Amino acid sequence: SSFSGKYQLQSQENFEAFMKAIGLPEELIQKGKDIKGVSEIVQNGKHFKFTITAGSKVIQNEFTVGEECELETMTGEKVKTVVQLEGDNKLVTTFKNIKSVTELNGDIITNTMTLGDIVFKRISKRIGT
Ligand SMILES: CCCCCCCCCCCCCCCC(=O)O
């Protein structure tokens, strides 16, 4: 249950570079850059559900740690990959050559995505519920 909760974006680095390199329509890129998105996570042991809401875009995912899962990414593209826990508080995966690291520290989730030289970091904070 460690990750469960509702969290909202505080700040982020390199949103616009990252999002162009992954092929997000620039129209979504401009609408999306200053949105403070909400993520909802339900962890139950190894099973995760997470919903990411950014404006009108709602992206809902689920995965079992250690198993092949299908992840809907930024673009709508669904990619087969594995998510691993590296200790209770860290989720790690690689899709489309992006390394995603999600780390919970108390009430703060830091998410770092790297595609080559591009490091897209996001910092989110718990918001009751
Ligand atoms: C009004 C609708 C348009 C709103 C713009 C859509 C938001 C696009 C931003 C994509 C960010 C989602 C990736 C963050 C999830 C994560 O880092 O794990």
Ligand SMILES: CCCCCCCCCCCCCCCC(=O)O
């Ligand atoms: C749409 C982006 C795909 C997400 C790929 C990461 C899969 C495992 C981690 C999910 C945790 C959700 C991230 C919450 C914090 C945040 O919004 O930055």
